[PDB]
Amino acid sequence: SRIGRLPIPVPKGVSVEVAPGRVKVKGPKGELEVPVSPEMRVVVEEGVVRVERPSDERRHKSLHGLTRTLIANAVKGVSEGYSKELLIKGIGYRARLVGRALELTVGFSHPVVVEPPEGITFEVPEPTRVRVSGIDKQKVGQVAANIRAIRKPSAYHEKGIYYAGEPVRLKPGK
Amino acid sequence: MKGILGVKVGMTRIFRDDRAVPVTVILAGPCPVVQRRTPEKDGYTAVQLGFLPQNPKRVNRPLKGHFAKAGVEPVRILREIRDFNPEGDTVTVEIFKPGERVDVTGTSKGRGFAGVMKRWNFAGGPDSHGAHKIHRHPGSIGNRKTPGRVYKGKKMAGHYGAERVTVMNLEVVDVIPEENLLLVKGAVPGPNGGLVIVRETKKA
Amino acid sequence: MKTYVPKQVEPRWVLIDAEGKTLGRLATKIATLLRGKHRPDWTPNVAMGDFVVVVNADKIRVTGKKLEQKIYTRYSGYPGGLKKIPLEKMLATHPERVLEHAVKGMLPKGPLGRRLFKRLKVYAGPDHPHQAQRPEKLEV
Amino acid sequence: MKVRASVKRICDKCKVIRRHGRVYVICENPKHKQRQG
RNA sequence: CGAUGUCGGCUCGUCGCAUCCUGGGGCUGAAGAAGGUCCCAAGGGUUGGGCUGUUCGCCCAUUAAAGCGGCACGCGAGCUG
RNA sequence: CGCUGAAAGCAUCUAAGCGGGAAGCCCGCCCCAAGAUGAGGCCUCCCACGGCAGCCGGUAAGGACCCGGGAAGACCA
Ligand SMILES: [Mg+2]
Ligand SMILES: [Mg+2]
Ligand SMILES: [Mg+2]
Ligand SMILES: [Mg+2]
Ligand SMILES: [Mg+2]
Ligand SMILES: [Mg+2]
Ligand SMILES: [Mg+2]
Ligand SMILES: [Mg+2]
Ligand SMILES: [Mg+2]
Ligand SMILES: [Mg+2]
Ligand SMILES: [Mg+2]
Ligand SMILES: [Mg+2]
Ligand SMILES: [Mg+2]
Ligand SMILES: [Mg+2]
Ligand SMILES: [Mg+2]
Ligand SMILES: [Mg+2]
Ligand SMILES: [Mg+2]
Ligand SMILES: [Mg+2]
Ligand SMILES: [Mg+2]
Ligand SMILES: [Mg+2]
Ligand SMILES: [Mg+2]
Ligand SMILES: [Mg+2]
Ligand SMILES: [Mg+2]
Ligand SMILES: [Mg+2]
Ligand SMILES: [Mg+2]
Ligand SMILES: [Mg+2]
Ligand SMILES: [Mg+2]
Ligand SMILES: [Mg+2]
Ligand SMILES: [Mg+2]
Ligand SMILES: [Mg+2]
Ligand SMILES: [Mg+2]
Ligand SMILES: [Mg+2]
Ligand SMILES: [Mg+2]
Ligand SMILES: [Mg+2]
Ligand SMILES: [Mg+2]
Ligand SMILES: [Mg+2]
Ligand SMILES: [Mg+2]
Ligand SMILES: [Mg+2]
Ligand SMILES: [Mg+2]
Ligand SMILES: [Mg+2]
Ligand SMILES: [Mg+2]
Ligand SMILES: [Mg+2]
Ligand SMILES: [Mg+2]
Ligand SMILES: [Mg+2]
Ligand SMILES: [Mg+2]
Ligand SMILES: [Mg+2]
Ligand SMILES: [Mg+2]
Ligand SMILES: [Mg+2]
Ligand SMILES: [Mg+2]
Ligand SMILES: [Mg+2]
Ligand SMILES: [Mg+2]
Ligand SMILES: [Mg+2]
Ligand SMILES: [Mg+2]
Ligand SMILES: [Mg+2]
Ligand SMILES: [Mg+2]
Ligand SMILES: [Mg+2]
Ligand SMILES: [Mg+2]
Ligand SMILES: [Mg+2]
Ligand SMILES: [Mg+2]
Ligand SMILES: [Mg+2]
Ligand SMILES: [Mg+2]
Ligand SMILES: [Mg+2]
Ligand SMILES: [Mg+2]
Ligand SMILES: [Mg+2]
Ligand SMILES: [Mg+2]
Ligand SMILES: [Mg+2]
Ligand SMILES: [Mg+2]
Ligand SMILES: [Mg+2]
Ligand SMILES: [Mg+2]
Ligand SMILES: [Mg+2]
Ligand SMILES: [Mg+2]
Ligand SMILES: [Mg+2]
Ligand SMILES: [Mg+2]
Ligand SMILES: [Mg+2]
Ligand SMILES: [Mg+2]
Ligand SMILES: [Mg+2]
Ligand SMILES: [Mg+2]
Ligand SMILES: [Mg+2]
Ligand SMILES: [Mg+2]
Ligand SMILES: [Mg+2]
Ligand SMILES: [Mg+2]
Ligand SMILES: [Mg+2]
Ligand SMILES: [Zn+2]
């Protein structure tokens, strides 16, 4: 019943250096700087980072859980990394890898090409499955959301770009 | 950005792919560079061009010194082209090629004191049905006690023309370097013999 | 006895660093200096206050949501000629005017008040070109 | 989006949230989305 | 009340937005196309004619649309009458 | 409309932070514009003239008048 006080297991070997207003997380897959409120104290223990708040006021209670999750996401991101899968559905609808770029054929008069931002890698295992992967959890979910927005799931047909695991909710036509 | 100073010479039309093409003919070059405007010295980039040789007698001493400093024969007109730094020291009609699009600035023909109908295309008044000495008049110029005044910029009679006007995106139809001639499709501001400025167009 | 009236005095040039200071709370002090009301011989009908140089005026600070919500306004005299500019954009485009406007509104109206405003010299950035006047640094 | 002065839970999946100074009701049923106004 | 000229038209605009159109949206009993309803939005645009002094309205032919209000029911030291 | 995300173990576009998004807003286009008295900048020309921050006079760089005119114009410009 509290995220801010939950200690953060830090696997070896990722390092967590604390600094004014931020903490830096180095790991096997890159670095991430987490900007952290100065009112919160970030504490480095043996294989564990902890976050402490200076009072029980609402703002401190709110920054407390945020700051723990932010740091934990960076810790996961440099060790495990983050990924998000997209399933394409609909007859003509396919995807392919163009160099490093993502090309979607999804029923427009033209293909839609998505460039990767730095820290993002696109995978296309099969033509109806796309993988967005990177160390930055926020960035991964952003890029995945941008690609879904290109042709959202239709309200009447299993057609469009879906998050893997997204339920298919269709209302009736005629 | 590139540009040249010129003289509007007249209008005709040519035939191109079995189409009559109205053209204004411009005697443009040649324009010696007379001063360059640099960010270090002047705070911006431009080139002061000269145009038309002048009877040196008519050139006073401060102008003479100006032409001397940039070893150049005395010229009748100095105009700057903004954001233009030509590699050479003489600008000629060849900076444009047929097919390019240009903007042309001239001084429009002067209407002098113009009525509200000529200057602003007001409808004037009826010419019968009782209309009383208001056939070319502007009608109402306001409201009543609120606001009890007339707006700034209200359209009224007054001097009209002899002003700077730029026509944009004119097609260059031909360039004749042997005569420093530019053929521009359509209409260009001002009278024949008028000074004009021809610049690369700002429309993408 | 009549009240002392001062002969013309050489005015005092001062330098103020605006960085981090609160926009309006700094301005009240500058207007005081411009009026010369810090001076024991203050006279209301002569310009006898300080000349005030300000640096880092672009680093002036402000509370609440004023960066987005404070609106400066200009009226051109034409129909529809009310221009609204937020603090944000003014700081991005003419930052020295933010402090200049605050101080001007705190000076008296009239010929002397406008004269006093000319004795205020406001600069974005840490530098100013008045080294020859050798301004005395003030912590206010 | 229904825009009204009285915003209320319509069904038990409805959630009354405050967002950027405004009371919204969000829900899995799109008819129930509400903004106070 | 030792005078603040009145309806309607014409002319000339300008503003409000409770938006007629065009731009952006959510919901739909939204398959598509076309609509309905609400939200944002005043930048521009918003036709010609028959009837009647008319404003308004009805009608004809179109239109993206043929918006509604304020300005002394805007405007007669501007015209009409 | 989102992403990441607590308070509130879930959830939440938001409280920290980030993204997308209108013929509309700022700029971009065209015209005026330093009486912008906050009177700006650059190039070039003149010069330290006599007599008694002032005055008198003759000049300097230049300017004005006058005249021939002008797709400039009521005049003037
Ligand atoms: Mg460790
Ligand atoms: Mg402790
Ligand atoms: Mg000209
Ligand atoms: Mg004329
Ligand atoms: Mg007229
Ligand atoms: Mg006309
Ligand atoms: Mg006209
Ligand atoms: Mg008419
Ligand atoms: Mg007529
Ligand atoms: Mg008539
Ligand atoms: Mg009559
Ligand atoms: Mg008559
Ligand atoms: Mg009239
Ligand atoms: Mg009246
Ligand atoms: Mg008034
Ligand atoms: Mg004129
Ligand atoms: Mg040809
Ligand atoms: Mg002509
Ligand atoms: Mg003080
Ligand atoms: Mg403040
Ligand atoms: Mg500035
Ligand atoms: Mg005041
Ligand atoms: Mg007073
Ligand atoms: Mg209930
Ligand atoms: Mg929900
Ligand atoms: Mg009466
Ligand atoms: Mg009387
Ligand atoms: Mg009376
Ligand atoms: Mg009377
Ligand atoms: Mg009536
Ligand atoms: Mg109106
Ligand atoms: Mg509205
Ligand atoms: Mg619309
Ligand atoms: Mg629409
Ligand atoms: Mg549809
Ligand atoms: Mg249907
Ligand atoms: Mg249907
Ligand atoms: Mg709709
Ligand atoms: Mg709504
Ligand atoms: Mg809404
Ligand atoms: Mg509008
Ligand atoms: Mg308007
Ligand atoms: Mg309108
Ligand atoms: Mg008839
Ligand atoms: Mg008939
Ligand atoms: Mg009729
Ligand atoms: Mg009628
Ligand atoms: Mg009739
Ligand atoms: Mg009727
Ligand atoms: Mg009837
Ligand atoms: Mg139609
Ligand atoms: Mg329609
Ligand atoms: Mg009609
Ligand atoms: Mg009205
Ligand atoms: Mg009434
Ligand atoms: Mg009435
Ligand atoms: Mg009336
Ligand atoms: Mg009316
Ligand atoms: Mg009237
Ligand atoms: Mg009358
Ligand atoms: Mg009348
Ligand atoms: Mg009247
Ligand atoms: Mg009257
Ligand atoms: Mg009148
Ligand atoms: Mg009157
Ligand atoms: Mg009549
Ligand atoms: Mg009668
Ligand atoms: Mg989430
Ligand atoms: Mg709960
Ligand atoms: Mg926030
Ligand atoms: Mg954004
Ligand atoms: Mg945004
Ligand atoms: Mg998006
Ligand atoms: Mg944007
Ligand atoms: Mg357009
Ligand atoms: Mg100019
Ligand atoms: Mg000047
Ligand atoms: Mg100028
Ligand atoms: Mg002023
Ligand atoms: Mg000057
Ligand atoms: Mg300058
Ligand atoms: Mg002479
Ligand atoms: Zn519900």
Curated annotation (Swiss-Prot), chain A:
One of its GO terms (molecular function) is structural constituent of ribosome. Keywords: Ribonucleoprotein, Ribosomal protein, RNA-binding, rRNA-binding. The keyword Lipid biosynthesis does not apply. GO terms for biological process: cytoplasmic translation. It holds the Pfam family Ribosomal_L6. InterPro entries: Ribosomal_uL6-like (IPR000702), Ribosomal_uL6-like_a/b-dom_sf (IPR036789), Ribosomal_uL6_a/b-dom (IPR020040), Ribosomal_uL6_bac-type (IPR019906). One of its GO terms (cellular component) is cytosolic large ribosomal subunit. The keyword Magnesium does not apply. It comes from the Bacteria. This protein binds to the 23S rRNA, and is important in its secondary structure. It is located near the subunit interface in the base of the L7/L12 stalk, and near the tRNA binding site of the peptidyltransferase center. Part of the 50S ribosomal subunit. Belongs to the universal ribosomal protein uL6 family. This is Large ribosomal subunit protein uL6. It comes from Thermus thermophilus (strain ATCC 27634 / DSM 579 / HB8). The gene is rplF.
From Swiss-Prot, chain B:
InterPro entries: Ribosomal_uL3, Ribosomal_uL3_bac/org-type, Ribosomal_uL3_CS, Transl_B-barrel_sf. Pfam families: Ribosomal_L3. GO terms for biological process: translation. One of its GO terms (cellular component) is cytosolic large ribosomal subunit. Gene3D superfamilies: 3.30.160.810, Translation factors. One of its GO terms (molecular function) is rRNA binding. Keywords: Methylation, Ribonucleoprotein, Ribosomal protein, RNA-binding, rRNA-binding. The mass differences between the observed and calculated masses are suggested to be due to methylation, which is known to occur in the E.coli and R.palustris orthologs. PANTHER family: 50S RIBOSOMAL PROTEIN L3, LARGE RIBOSOMAL SUBUNIT PROTEIN UL3C. Part of the 50S ribosomal subunit. Forms a cluster with proteins L14 and L19. Belongs to the universal ribosomal protein uL3 family. One of the primary rRNA binding proteins, it binds directly near the 3'-end of the 23S rRNA, where it nucleates assembly of the 50S subunit. This is Large ribosomal subunit protein uL3. It comes from Thermus thermophilus (strain ATCC 27634 / DSM 579 / HB8).
UniProtKB/Swiss-Prot annotation, chain C:
GO terms for molecular function: mRNA binding; structural constituent of ribosome. PROSITE patterns: RIBOSOMAL_L13. The gene is rplM. It holds the Pfam family Ribosomal_L13. SUPFAM superfamilies: Ribosomal protein L13. NCBIfam families: rplM_bact. InterPro entries: Ribosomal_uL13, Ribosomal_uL13_bac-type, Ribosomal_uL13_CS, Ribosomal_uL13_sf. This is Large ribosomal subunit protein uL13. GO terms for cellular component: cytosolic large ribosomal subunit. This protein is one of the early assembly proteins of the 50S ribosomal subunit, although it is not seen to bind rRNA by itself. It is important during the early stages of 50S assembly. GO terms for biological process: negative regulation of translation; translation. The keyword Cytoplasm does not apply. Part of the 50S ribosomal subunit. The keyword Oxidoreductase does not apply. Keywords: Ribonucleoprotein, Ribosomal protein. Belongs to the universal ribosomal protein uL13 family.
From Swiss-Prot, chain D:
Part of the 50S ribosomal subunit. One of its GO terms (biological process) is translation. GO terms for cellular component: cytoplasm; ribonucleoprotein complex; ribosome. InterPro entries: Ribosomal_bL36, Ribosomal_bL36_sp. SUPFAM superfamilies: Ribosomal protein L36. This is Large ribosomal subunit protein bL36. Coiled coil: none annotated. Its cofactor is Zn(2+). It comes from the Bacteria. Keywords: Metal-binding, Ribonucleoprotein, Ribosomal protein, Zinc. HAMAP family: Ribosomal_bL36. Binds 1 zinc ion per subunit. Disulfide bonds: none annotated. The gene is rpmJ. Zn(2+) binds at residues 11, 14, 27, 32. It holds the Pfam family Ribosomal_L36. One of its GO terms (molecular function) is structural constituent of ribosome. It comes from Thermus thermophilus (strain ATCC 27634 / DSM 579 / HB8). Belongs to the bacterial ribosomal protein bL36 family.
